[PDB]
Structures are given as C-alpha cells and as structure tokens.
Design an enzyme around this catalytic site. Structure first.
Site, PDB file in Angstrom:
ATOM      1  N   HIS A   1     -29.624   3.487  12.808  1.00 44.25           N
ATOM      2  CA  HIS A   1     -29.889   2.193  13.812  1.00 44.25           C
ATOM      3  C   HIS A   1     -31.190   1.423  13.542  1.00 44.25           C
ATOM      4  CE1 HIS A   1     -29.408  -1.262  16.334  1.00 44.25           C
ATOM      5  NE2 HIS A   1     -27.820  -1.001  16.504  1.00 44.25           N
TER       6      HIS A   1
ATOM      7  N   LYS B   1     -22.129  -3.733  10.251  1.00 51.95           N
ATOM      8  CA  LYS B   1     -22.013  -4.646  11.827  1.00 51.95           C
ATOM      9  C   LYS B   1     -22.787  -5.692  11.327  1.00 51.95           C
ATOM     10  CE  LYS B   1     -20.982  -3.239  15.380  1.00 51.95           C
ATOM     11  NZ  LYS B   1     -21.208  -2.756  16.795  1.00 51.95           N
TER      12      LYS B   1
ATOM     13  N   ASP C   1     -28.134 -10.200  13.645  1.00 52.64           N
ATOM     14  CA  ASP C   1     -28.848 -10.522  14.907  1.00 52.64           C
ATOM     15  C   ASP C   1     -29.902 -10.801  14.940  1.00 52.64           C
ATOM     16  OD1 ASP C   1     -29.594 -10.235  17.505  1.00 52.64           O
ATOM     17  OD2 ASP C   1     -28.323  -8.585  18.005  1.00 52.64           O
TER      18      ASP C   1
ATOM     19  N   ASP D   1     -31.835 -15.693  25.546  1.00 54.72           N
ATOM     20  CA  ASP D   1     -32.372 -14.932  26.662  1.00 54.72           C
ATOM     21  C   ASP D   1     -33.768 -14.465  26.293  1.00 54.72           C
ATOM     22  OD1 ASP D   1     -32.217 -12.404  24.868  1.00 54.72           O
ATOM     23  OD2 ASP D   1     -30.098 -12.699  24.668  1.00 54.72           O
TER      24      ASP D   1
ATOM     25  N   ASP E   1     -29.454 -14.244  19.595  1.00 57.31           N
ATOM     26  CA  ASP E   1     -28.666 -13.327  18.435  1.00 57.31           C
ATOM     27  C   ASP E   1     -28.131 -14.095  17.331  1.00 57.31           C
ATOM     28  OD1 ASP E   1     -26.763 -12.205  17.062  1.00 57.31           O
ATOM     29  OD2 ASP E   1     -25.773 -11.202  19.027  1.00 57.31           O
TER      30      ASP E   1
ATOM     31  N   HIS F   1     -34.075 -11.862  23.204  1.00 59.66           N
ATOM     32  CA  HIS F   1     -33.977 -12.387  21.765  1.00 59.66           C
ATOM     33  C   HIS F   1     -35.130 -13.219  21.511  1.00 59.66           C
ATOM     34  CE1 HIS F   1     -29.705 -10.648  21.865  1.00 59.66           C
ATOM     35  NE2 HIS F   1     -30.167 -10.382  20.733  1.00 59.66           N
TER      36      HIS F   1
ATOM     37  N   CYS G   1     -32.613 -10.467  16.586  1.00 55.80           N
ATOM     38  CA  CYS G   1     -33.488  -9.401  17.386  1.00 55.80           C
ATOM     39  C   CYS G   1     -33.871  -8.422  16.342  1.00 55.80           C
ATOM     40  CB  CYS G   1     -33.081  -8.862  18.664  1.00 55.80           C
ATOM     41  SG  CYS G   1     -31.432  -7.595  18.432  1.00 55.80           S
ATOM     42  N   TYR G   2     -33.068  -8.294  15.176  1.00 49.51           N
ATOM     43  CA  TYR G   2     -33.433  -7.158  14.328  1.00 49.51           C
ATOM     44  C   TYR G   2     -34.295  -7.832  13.187  1.00 49.51           C
ATOM     45  CZ  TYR G   2     -29.505  -4.751  16.138  1.00 49.51           C
ATOM     46  OH  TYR G   2     -28.554  -4.381  17.479  1.00 49.51           O
TER      47      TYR G   2
ATOM     48  N   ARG H   1     -26.901  -1.934  11.745  1.00 55.18           N
ATOM     49  CA  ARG H   1     -26.565  -0.672  11.252  1.00 55.18           C
ATOM     50  C   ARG H   1     -25.496  -1.273  10.118  1.00 55.18           C
ATOM     51  NH1 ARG H   1     -22.503   1.550  15.842  1.00 55.18           N
ATOM     52  NH2 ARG H   1     -22.895  -0.083  17.284  1.00 55.18           N
TER      53      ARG H   1
HETATM   54  N1  LIG Z   1     -32.658   0.348  24.811  1.00 53.12           N
HETATM   55  C1  LIG Z   1     -31.808  -0.276  24.081  1.00 53.12           C
HETATM   56  C2  LIG Z   1     -31.162  -0.984  23.382  1.00 53.12           C
HETATM   57  C3  LIG Z   1     -29.655  -1.056  23.209  1.00 53.12           C
HETATM   58  C4  LIG Z   1     -28.809  -1.651  22.792  1.00 53.12           C
HETATM   59  C5  LIG Z   1     -29.238  -2.916  21.964  1.00 53.12           C
HETATM   60  C6  LIG Z   1     -30.636  -3.254  21.975  1.00 53.12           C
HETATM   61  C7  LIG Z   1     -31.456  -2.348  22.834  1.00 53.12           C
HETATM   62  O1  LIG Z   1     -32.801  -2.998  22.755  1.00 53.12           O
HETATM   63  C8  LIG Z   1     -33.371  -3.159  24.134  1.00 53.12           C
HETATM   64  C9  LIG Z   1     -34.667  -2.677  24.527  1.00 53.12           C
HETATM   65  C10 LIG Z   1     -34.954  -2.926  25.867  1.00 53.12           C
HETATM   66  C11 LIG Z   1     -34.195  -3.553  26.818  1.00 53.12           C
HETATM   67  C12 LIG Z   1     -34.517  -3.748  28.168  1.00 53.12           C
HETATM   68  C13 LIG Z   1     -33.618  -4.306  29.264  1.00 53.12           C
HETATM   69  C14 LIG Z   1     -32.468  -4.770  28.652  1.00 53.12           C
HETATM   70  C15 LIG Z   1     -31.916  -4.462  27.329  1.00 53.12           C
HETATM   71  C16 LIG Z   1     -32.768  -3.799  26.404  1.00 53.12           C
HETATM   72  C17 LIG Z   1     -32.581  -3.897  25.173  1.00 53.12           C
HETATM   73  N2  LIG Z   1     -30.799  -4.750  26.784  1.00 53.12           N
HETATM   74  C18 LIG Z   1     -29.508  -4.198  27.172  1.00 53.12           C
HETATM   75  C19 LIG Z   1     -28.392  -5.196  26.969  1.00 53.12           C
HETATM   76  C20 LIG Z   1     -28.863  -5.961  25.732  1.00 53.12           C
HETATM   77  N3  LIG Z   1     -28.543  -6.602  24.761  1.00 53.12           N
HETATM   78  C21 LIG Z   1     -28.047  -5.707  23.804  1.00 53.12           C
HETATM   79  C22 LIG Z   1     -28.437  -6.141  22.551  1.00 53.12           C
HETATM   80  C23 LIG Z   1     -28.807  -7.319  22.033  1.00 53.12           C
HETATM   81  N4  LIG Z   1     -29.145  -7.322  20.515  1.00 53.12           N
HETATM   82  C24 LIG Z   1     -29.060  -6.148  20.071  1.00 53.12           C
HETATM   83  N5  LIG Z   1     -28.553  -5.378  21.220  1.00 53.12           N
HETATM   84  C25 LIG Z   1     -28.183  -3.986  21.058  1.00 53.12           C
HETATM   85  C26 LIG Z   1     -30.287  -6.039  26.117  1.00 53.12           C
HETATM   86  O2  LIG Z   1     -31.175  -7.044  25.986  1.00 53.12           O
HETATM   87  C1  LIG Z   2     -38.560   0.617  22.986  1.00 46.81           C
HETATM   88  C2  LIG Z   2     -37.013   0.553  22.991  1.00 46.81           C
HETATM   89  C3  LIG Z   2     -36.254   0.694  24.135  1.00 46.81           C
HETATM   90  C4  LIG Z   2     -36.418   0.125  21.710  1.00 46.81           C
HETATM   91  C5  LIG Z   2     -34.947  -0.120  21.665  1.00 46.81           C
HETATM   92  C6  LIG Z   2     -34.753  -0.171  20.140  1.00 46.81           C
HETATM   93  C7  LIG Z   2     -33.036  -0.511  20.137  1.00 46.81           C
HETATM   94  C8  LIG Z   2     -33.029  -2.079  19.455  1.00 46.81           C
HETATM   95  C9  LIG Z   2     -32.064   0.380  19.843  1.00 46.81           C
HETATM   96  C10 LIG Z   2     -30.813   0.088  19.827  1.00 46.81           C
HETATM   97  C11 LIG Z   2     -29.722   1.177  19.940  1.00 46.81           C
HETATM   98  C12 LIG Z   2     -28.087   0.980  19.887  1.00 46.81           C
HETATM   99  C13 LIG Z   2     -27.488   1.860  21.032  1.00 46.81           C
HETATM  100  C14 LIG Z   2     -27.636  -0.004  19.551  1.00 46.81           C
HETATM  101  C15 LIG Z   2     -26.169  -0.218  19.554  1.00 46.81           C
HETATM  102  O1  LIG Z   2     -25.837  -1.546  20.349  1.00 46.81           O
HETATM  103  P1  LIG Z   2     -25.017  -2.468  19.882  1.00 46.81           P
HETATM  104  O2  LIG Z   2     -23.375  -1.968  19.262  1.00 46.81           O
HETATM  105  O3  LIG Z   2     -24.744  -3.629  20.870  1.00 46.81           O
HETATM  106  O4  LIG Z   2     -25.550  -3.396  18.623  1.00 46.81           O
HETATM  107  P2  LIG Z   2     -25.230  -3.721  17.133  1.00 46.81           P
HETATM  108  O5  LIG Z   2     -24.000  -3.947  17.019  1.00 46.81           O
HETATM  109  O6  LIG Z   2     -26.187  -4.654  16.418  1.00 46.81           O
HETATM  110  O7  LIG Z   2     -25.341  -2.212  16.464  1.00 46.81           O
HETATM  111 ZN   LIG Z   3     -29.785  -8.853  19.462  1.00 49.69          ZN
END
Ligand SMILES: N#Cc1ccc2cc1Oc1ccc3cccc(c3c1)N1CC[C@@H](NCc3cncn3C2)C1=O
Ligand SMILES: CC(C)=CCC/C(C)=C/CC/C(C)=C/COP(=O)(O)OP(=O)(O)O
Ligand SMILES: [Zn+2]
Ligand SMILES: OC[C@H]1O[C@@](CO)(O[C@H]2O[C@H](CO)[C@@H](O)[C@H](O)[C@H]2O)[C@@H](O)[C@@H]1O
Lengths: 313, 407
Positions: B232, B278, B281, B343, B336, B346, B283-284, B275
């Site tokens: 990921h 999927k 987005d 938010d 996203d 993002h 943020c990636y 990944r």
């Molecule tokens: N650690 C971790 C992590 C797990 C999953 C994602 C992204 C992640 O990166 C981060 C890093 C730090 C974070 C701190 C507070 C809340 C967060 C974080 C997500 N979440 C959880 C809900 C969320 N939203 C999910 C989201 C949005 N875009 C991608 N994701 C997947 C979102 O902001």
């Molecule tokens: C320092 C720090 C805390 C960094 C976090 C890095 C990061 C972005 C991790 C993501 C891990 C994860 C469980 C993704 C699946 O979420 P999903 O299924 O919602 O997302 P997807 O469909 O895009 O894979």
């Molecule tokens: Zn995102």
C-alpha cells in the site's frame, strides 16, 4: 444498560450514582486552536472519562462509561487502553467482550483500535475459533478491508489455521478475480505452506495465473502475481514463458504483456544470454513503444529503463 | 498563446486509456468505470474545443478554509478528537505550502496547545490528557518544526521522547504505535522521523528496524503494513522514508519497488491509487508520488548513470492535472476525488503532492514544471518529512547543537 441514542439516556452529570465524583474539564488553554465545539453529550462523557482516568478508578461504572466514550469516538486509543485495564482488573468475561467487539467492528471496520482490541482478546483467550468466520463476514461487506486481511493473516499464522485458506482464496477470486487483496493472500498461503520451490506447485500456480490472464487480459493483479512468483529466481530462467507470451502478443496484447516482455529481456541481458545485441534491441524498441504509445503515463519510467539497459549492456 | 495550455488528459488519444474490462465485470471494474466516467466529465469541462484555459489553484479559497480550521471546528470533527496535533500539522503544512504567513500569535497559541498535548512520559497524545501515541507525536513534532521558532523547538521534552520511543521498541525491530498498541510500518516512520529531527537517535534505538521494514516489502514490490500484507502506498512511503532516514534503503529491492509505485499512477485519471486495483485518491499524490524523489535520491547515491536530471519517474503533468481539475473544492479545501467532501487531511496531501509534481531537484540540478498560471507554484516540501526543506534544515541544525539525551 443504556445507549447514547436511547430515549432514556441520562447525562452523567445528572446520574446519582456518579454524583460522588467531580468531572474533569479538558484544558485546551486560554487561546485554543483546532478547538472542536463538542456536543453536550460528547463533552459530558469525556469530562467524566477524564475524571475516572485521572483517578485511575478501576470500577464497573468506569467500565460501562468507556462503552459510551467509545461510541462517541471509537478512534480514542486512550479509552480503549483504559477499557482493557478494566477488563483485567475487574476480571470481566472476555467472551462477552468478544461479542461486544464483534458488533463494534461490524459498525466501524475501518479503524485501527477496534481490530487491535479484538486481537488482544483473542491473545488473552488463546481462542481463535470465531475469527475466520467473523473476518469472512466483514470481507463479505468489503472484500478489500485492509485491517480484516491483516487480522486474518495474524490469526492463521499464530494459530496455524492454514488448512482451508487456499479454498477461501479460490472462492473470492471467483467472485472478483481483480481483488488484489486475495492474490496477496494467495501468495501468503502458498509461501507459508508448501512454498514455491516445489516445481509442481510453481507449475500449478503459473498455469492457474496464465489461465486467469487469458480470461481477463487487462487485470493487473494476475500479471503482478505471475511476475511475483518468478522474479526471485529470475524471469529469464523460464524460457517457455517468453515464447508463450510472445504468441499471445499479436492477440491478447496489452501494456502488461509488453512490460512483462521487457522485464524478461532485462533479466536475460543480466544473465549473459545469447544474441545479446538482438535482445537489447528488442527491449529498447518495446521501451519506446511503451513510452510513446502503450503506457505513456509511465513514459519517464520507460525512458529510464531504456537508458539503464544501455548503460548495462 | 500564453492564454491557452494544452493538457495531457485532454488529448484525443487519452480516451484510449479508459478501462478495458475484457467484458468481464466484477465489483472492481464496475467501481473503476464509475470513477472514470465522472472524471471524463470533469476533464471535458476544462476544454472548449481548441481553447484550453490555464488551470488555477484556488489559493485564496484554500487559505480561508485553512485559516478558519486552525482556530475552531464543528462537532463534525469529534471523530478527530484523538488526532488534534494532526489537524495542526495538516493545516500549518498546507499554509506553509501556499506560502501563507503564520501570525506570531497563532504560532504561539499552537505551541501552547501542543505543549498541553505532550505527555509527562514523553511523546504527544491526540489531545490534552490523552496517552502519547506515535501518530500525533509525529504530527506534533512536524507542526512545531514548521513554526520553527526556539519557542516551538523547546516545547519538545527530548529526554522523555527518547525514553518513550524505547518503551515502544520491540525485539524484532518494530515499534508499537503506543503502549499496549498495534504494530505496523507507520510506527517505524513516526519514530525515525521525530528522532532524526530532534537528534535523539542512539545506535541501538533502530537496531533491527531496517530488517523488519524490508520484511514488509512483498511480492508486489511495494510495502505492506506488516510482513505478509498487501503493498500500500501509505505503508510504502512510511517504509522507504524510514529507511532513508536510517540510511538503509539498500535493504529493499529498489527495482521492484520502483516498478510497483510507477504502476500505481492511473493511466486515465492521472492521479495515484493506494494499491493495485483500487481507486484513485488525491492524498496518494503524496504517499505514492512522494516515493519517486526518495527513490531518485537512493539510486543517485548508488551512482545510477541512467537517472533523469530533470524529472521524477512519474507523469508530473498528469498528476497536476488530476489534482487541479478533480481535487479542488470550489468553496476551498481539497479532496479525494470528485463527489467527496473536503477535509484537512486531503487538503494537506493533495497540496503536498502538487508541490512534489511541480519541483524536481537533484544535486545542483533544479527543474520546475508548474502547470497552469504561474501563481500555482507552491513552496517545496521535503520528501522524507513532508515539511519545508528550509524547516528541516533549521530544525536539524538547532537540535544537533543539543546532546542525545543521556548520550
Ligand atoms: N494511519 C492511517 C491511514 C489509514 C487509512 C487511510 C489513510 C491513512 O492515513 C492517515 C494518517 C493519519 C491520520 C490521522 C487521523 C485520521 C486519519 C488519518 C489517516 N484518517 C482515518 C480515516 C481517514 N480517511 C481514510 C483515508 C483517506 N484517504 C485515504 N485513506 C486511507 C483519515 O483521514
Ligand atoms: C505517518 C502515517 C500515520 C502514515 C499513514 C500512511 C497511510 C496512508 C497508510 C494507509 C494504510 C491503509 C490501512 C489503507 C487502507 O485504507 P483504504 O481501504 O480506505 O484505502 P484504499 O482504498 O485507498 O486502499
Ligand atoms: Zn485519501
Ligand atoms: O519485491 C520483491 C522483493 O522483496 C523482498 C524483500 O525486500 O521479498 C518479499 O517478496 C518475496 C517474493 O518476491 C517474498 O518471498 C518475501 O517474503 C517478501 O518479503 C526481496 O527478497 C524481493 O526481491
């Protein structure tokens, strides 16, 4: 007893059984930043949570309070930690807690704290009997939930429950052959059971994957798995694969097949292959085709590969 | 003409990049096709036959949204009550990228608040009185470094921070996210990031960590949360960035990692997915695209003679097009994908990714590619820490003048 949304729910500041303890307000300082304007119910629960935490009160009332704090914010790891301290101190029935975490995860499956809590319970009980079925239900709702798959791998590996996972993998691949999480589980299962050194196993896997590719030529996961199970030994170590892919190019072509050919040529050149010049020329032509027409989004990468090949051979 | 700028996503051949489901529909292809249909509509809204107006980053709208969030939030943010230092970081870094000054008063207030989040056992919690956790600790330290004043730097209790990291270190090289908490690659990165910035790294602190991270790289080439798990972008960024800090990048198969991340950029959307198979987005734009400058540096260190001296190994223009056309909320803030709500998370990562896509830098070579109006140019960001490079240098220089706690 009573949920946060129940019609008879009463704020903690109004509960007689809680009158003996003073709530502890959150101190954000005189000039707060990123200040959340909490609802009355949210602040009420946390003012009391802060009081019990600060008092380190290991009580049944404190235990019930954490349930409300969790419903308000399931991502509050501090509450979860304290709840586990209480489960221990109060010698709470862990099977009951398992039923609780089961319902919690069903509601909020994309959360780190809830899955970790469940893992701790399973570890404390040394009882994985409900795991595979529970996880399967979560995955039936979201077949790619990352936490779910991670928890599944842990349980399987920790309690050695490998027996039926390949069958499970095959069923999910049937439902969605593009589910990358399942191809990952496939590698996880095989590498930890029979391994890929058994040539009969490797042949079975290569045949399986090639069949999936013919069925869905543009599904990247199958192509990635094919490369994944052959890359360590070296793609050039499988001469028949090149020929077979070569025959499909005219028809079942795609950037995935073309890229795979380049990967093969790359490895071939790395291993003192015959007709070095010819192979290099073929590889460079494909890199150009990928960069200019078939995989332009990755033009910089393909140009780099072209230059790398020339610097090495 | 200067008032028209052709776009990669608007080329006629771009239509050929649409998903080919081979006439075999599964939940995956159906969802992917839905996103693509919406994205095509958006792309088309920026084209008027041969007239293609320059793309505009709505700076002022984003600024006002950020400025407001730094002070107060509705109860809609109760779900982030355990991640307030993250809100501080995401907002401050976004403002920093937008080159928006932070008033001295606001700066001191943030400092005071983060001091209240700092635990007596070391590290920072999600809010005042909460237990320390590596995630908000990472965010708090980054926020303090963005402010960059001695006042901000000195808030950090370095002695306790190092002790705290020790209290989370596992024998196999991994770290717990918090006491009695879960373990995954995020912890290694959070720990390495704060320890290197504050100069508290000891020889044994990260013993075994590099090896544990390498075990997280899988058959795909990317890195998973823990050994065995799916690759990921989020965990891959954490893993490689941590290794870069530890100077152990070579522990990974950089070739398979490079091929994996470059494959994560969507041929049609232009943005990155987290990944394989999927969805795209915004943020990636950082988590994934940010891996290219890290890989560039790693390969450059090994003397790779084929490395580019002007571009990262991903489609810089296409990513900028996805972000600018599809990830901006008209009311301010980023997101996203079209249809999602804005938010701060993002907003931070979309902007962070846009900056990486605009600026290339290796050695003495600097090459910028700012799509749209020139004002779109953002301040650069450090690929490892994701805060201004100037902030990294200033912080590291400051803390290097202090001894490692208890040596
Ligand atoms: N650690 C971790 C992590 C797990 C999953 C994602 C992204 C992640 O990166 C981060 C890093 C730090 C974070 C701190 C507070 C809340 C967060 C974080 C997500 N979440 C959880 C809900 C969320 N939203 C999910 C989201 C949005 N875009 C991608 N994701 C997947 C979102 O902001
Ligand atoms: C320092 C720090 C805390 C960094 C976090 C890095 C990061 C972005 C991790 C993501 C891990 C994860 C469980 C993704 C699946 O979420 P999903 O299924 O919602 O997302 P997807 O469909 O895009 O894979
Ligand atoms: Zn995102
Ligand atoms: O990307 C493959 C690359 O990763 C390493 C770790 O750096 O191993 C991973 O992938 C193998 C499959 O190719 C697995 O057997 C191994 O368990 C996983 O960690 C390298 O050895 C490999 O070249």
């Amino acid at each position: 007893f009573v949920s946060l949304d129940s019609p008879s729910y009463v704020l903690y500041r109004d509960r007689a059984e809680w009158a003996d303890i003073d709530p502890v307000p959150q101190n954000d300082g005189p000039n707060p930043v990123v200040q959340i304007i909490y609802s009355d119910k949210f602040r009420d629960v946390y003012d009391y949570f802060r009081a019990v935490l600060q008092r380190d009160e290991r009580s049944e009332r404190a235990f019930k309070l954490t349930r409300d704090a969790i419903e308000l914010n399931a991502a509050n790891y501090t509450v979860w930690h304290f709840r586990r301290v209480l489960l221990k101190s109060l010698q709470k029935d862990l099977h009951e807690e398992m039923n609780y975490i089961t319902a919690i995860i069903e509601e909020q499956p994309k959360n780190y704290q809830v899955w970790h809590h469940r893992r701790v319970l399973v570890e404390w009980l040394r009882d994985p009997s409900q795991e595979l079925e529970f996880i399967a239900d979560i995955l039936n709702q979201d077949a790619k939930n990352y936490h779910a798959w991670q928890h599944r791998q842990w349980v399987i590996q920790e309690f050695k429950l490998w027996d039926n996972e390949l069958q499970y993998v095959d069923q999910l691949l049937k439902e969605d052959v593009r589910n990358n999480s399942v191809w990952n589980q496939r590698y996880f299962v095989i590498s930890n059971t029979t391994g890929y050194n058994d040539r009969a196993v490797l042949e079975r896997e290569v045949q399986y994957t090639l069949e999936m590719i013919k069925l869905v030529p543009h599904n990247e996961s199958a192509w990635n798995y094919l490369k994944g199970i052959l890359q360590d030994r070296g793609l050039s170590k499988y001469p028949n694969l090149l020929n077979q892919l070569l025959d499909l190019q005219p028809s079942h072509s795609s950037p995935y097949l073309i890229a795979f050919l380049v990967d093969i040529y790359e490895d071939m050149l790395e291993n003192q292959c015959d007709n070095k010049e010819d192979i290099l020329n073929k590889a460079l032509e494909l890199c150009e085709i990928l960069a200019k027409e078939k995989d332009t989004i990755r033009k910089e990468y393909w140009r780099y590969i072209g230059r790398s090949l020339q610097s090495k051979h | 003409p200067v008032w028209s700028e052709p776009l990669y996503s608007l080329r006629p051949e771009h239509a050929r990049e649409r998903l080919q489901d081979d006439s075999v529909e599964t939940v995956t292809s159906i969802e992917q096709a839905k996103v693509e249909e919406k994205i095509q509509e958006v792309f088309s809204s920026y084209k008027f036959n041969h007239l293609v107006p320059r793309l505009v980053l709505q700076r002022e709208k984003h600024f006002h949204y950020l400025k407001r969030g730094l002070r107060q939030l509705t109860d809609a943010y109760e779900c982030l009550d355990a991640s307030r230092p993250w809100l501080c970081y995401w907002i401050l870094h976004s403002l920093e990228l937008l080159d928006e000054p932070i008033p001295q008063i606001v700066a001191t207030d943030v400092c005071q608040f983060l001091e209240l989040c700092q635990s007596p056992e070391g590290g920072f919690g999600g809010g005042p009185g909460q237990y320390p956790h590596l995630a908000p600790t990472y965010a708090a330290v980054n926020a303090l470094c963005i402010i960059g004043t001695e006042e901000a730097y000195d808030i950090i209790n370095r002695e306790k921070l190092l002790q705290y990291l020790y209290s989370l270190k596992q024998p196999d090289g991994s770290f717990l996210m918090h006491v009695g908490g879960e373990v995954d690659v995020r912890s290694a990165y959070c720990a390495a990031s704060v320890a290197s910035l504050t100069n508290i790294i000891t020889p044994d602190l990260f013993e075994g960590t590099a090896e544990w991270i390498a075990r997280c790289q899988n058959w795909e080439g990317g890195i998973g949360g823990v050994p065995g798990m799916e690759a990921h972008g989020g965990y891959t960024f954490c893993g490689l960035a941590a290794l870069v800090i530890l100077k152990r990048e070579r522990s990974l198969n950089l070739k398979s990692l490079l091929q994996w991340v470059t494959s994560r950029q969507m041929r049609f959307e232009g943005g990155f997915q987290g990944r394989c198979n999927k969805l795209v987005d915004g943020c990636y734009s950082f988590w994934q695209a940010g891996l290219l400058p890290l890989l560039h540096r790693a390969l450059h260190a090994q003397g790779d003679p084929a490395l580019s001296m002007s571009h990262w190994m991903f489609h810089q223009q296409a990513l900028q097009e996805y972000i600018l056309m599809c990830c901006q909320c008209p009311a301010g803030g980023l997101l996203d994908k079209p249809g999602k709500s804005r938010d701060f998370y993002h907003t931070c990562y979309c902007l962070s990714g846009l900056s990486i896509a605009q600026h290339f830098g290796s050695g003495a070579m600097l090459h910028d590619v700012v799509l749209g109006v020139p004002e779109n140019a953002l301040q650069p960001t450090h690929p490892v820490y994701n805060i201004g490079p100037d902030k990294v240098i200033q912080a590291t220089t400051y803390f290097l003048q202090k001894p490692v706690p208890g040596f």
